[PDB]
């Protein structure tokens, strides 16, 4: 019976202290990406020294950054940009290449 919107402020906005009124996020400073009840808009991400800016912040979408360079984001750690391995070690062949979303892939040359 009830809606996705129902009860909530729209994206690009945040709810007020008063529990009713919807206040707009500031383009560039902050953002809000879904029908929500956020007390404040989320601070827009600023791209890191070791990053490249693929999108600027809107009120409905956070800044999109990427490692680029010759580096990649590591998932198991904090999500930070490590430098890609240049080459595969001895006995192993390069099977994937350095992306912003991944280090090179090595695999055995079917030895041992």
């Amino acid at each position, epitope marked *: 019976r009830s809606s996705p919107s129902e009860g909530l402020c729209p994206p690009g906005h945040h709810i007020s202290e008063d529990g009713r009124d919807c206040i707009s996020c500031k383009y560039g400073q902050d953002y809000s990406t879904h029908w929500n009840d956020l007390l404040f808009c989320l601070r827009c991400t600023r791209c890191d020294s*070791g990053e490249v800016e693929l999108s600027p912040c809107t009120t409905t979408r956070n800044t999109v950054c990427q490692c680029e360079e*010759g580096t990649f984001r590591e998932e198991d750690s904090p999500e930070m*940009c490590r*430098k890609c*391995r*240049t080459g595969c070690p001895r006995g192993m062949v390069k099977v994937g290449d350095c992306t912003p979303w991944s280090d090179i892939e090595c695999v055995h040359k079917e030895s041992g």
Partner: antibody, heavy 118, light 108 residues
Framework: EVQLQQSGAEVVKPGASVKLSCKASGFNIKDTFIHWVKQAPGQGLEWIGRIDPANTNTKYDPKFQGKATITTDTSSNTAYMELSSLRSEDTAVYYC???????????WGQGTLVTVSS | EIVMTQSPATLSVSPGERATLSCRASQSISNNLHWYQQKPGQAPRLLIKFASQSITGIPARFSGSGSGTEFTLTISSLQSEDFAVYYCQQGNSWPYTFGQGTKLEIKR
């Protein structure tokens, strides 16, 4: 084991330039960003610049742009920093630095004493 | 430049005591703060990465905290080995910048 042998202490007159070497061992240079760092006598650390030895791609602090140029010789596995039109102000210890990340330095060279006087 | 400001300039303490060194930043740098130890007449050693993350081969007593503009290095119980200069360094923005260092001195 990982090591970073730097060149010997250089004694130079004002105006004259200097090329500082930094020979890397226990790893491939291309697998790590390399940065150089200035330290004046008993003073603050100043980041000079960074080079991606795979690319040959340099980034510098604007202060030193035109004074310091960083390079690598991947074949020799040694990084270099050329330093020109010297002044007594450039009397410093110059450090060669390594990192698997751009953001911070996991190993440091012993340093090169560069003295500038007539 | 992002300015890193380290307080205090110096710190007279004895062995066995806690030390808390602070490092303010002029602009927010998320977690992108790194601590180094330089002992007299030696090259600097990385102690801590990304505000709080420990480095292998470094004593457990060393520990870091902080985010945004305010960060603190802490040494839970000093030892003679530890009396040295300590620098903080930011990697969030070009140009990379260091704090001015806090020198620990023995108090006697």
């Amino acid at each position: 084991e990982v090591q970073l042998q730097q060149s010997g202490a250089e004694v130079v007159k004002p105006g004259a330039s200097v090329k500082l070497s930094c020979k890397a061992s226990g790893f491939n240079i291309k697998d790590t960003f390399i940065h150089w760092v200035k330290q004046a006598p008993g003073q603050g650390l100043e980041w000079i610049g960074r080079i991606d030895p795979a690319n040959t791609n340099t980034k510098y602090d604007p202060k030193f742009q035109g004074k310091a140029t960083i390079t690598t010789d991947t074949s020799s596995n040694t990084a270099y920093m050329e330093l020109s039109s010297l002044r007594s102000e450039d009397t410093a210890v110059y450090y060669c630095v390594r990192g698997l990340y751009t953001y911070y330095f996991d190993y440091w060279g012993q340093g090169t004493l560069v003295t500038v006087s007539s | 430049e992002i300015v890193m400001t380290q307080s205090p300039a110096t710190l007279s303490v004895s062995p066995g005591e806690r030390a808390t060194l602070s490092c303010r930043a002029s602009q927010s740098i998320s977690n992108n703060l790194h601590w180094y130890q330089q002992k007299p007449g030696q090259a600097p050693r990385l102690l801590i990465k990304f505000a709080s993350q420990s480095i292998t081969g470094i004593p457990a007593r060393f520990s870091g905290s902080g985010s945004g503009t305010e960060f603190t290095l802490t040494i839970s119980s000093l030892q003679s080995e530890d009396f040295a200069v300590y620098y903080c360094q930011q990697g969030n923005s070009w140009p990379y910048t260091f704090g001015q260092g806090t020198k620990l001195e023995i108090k006697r």
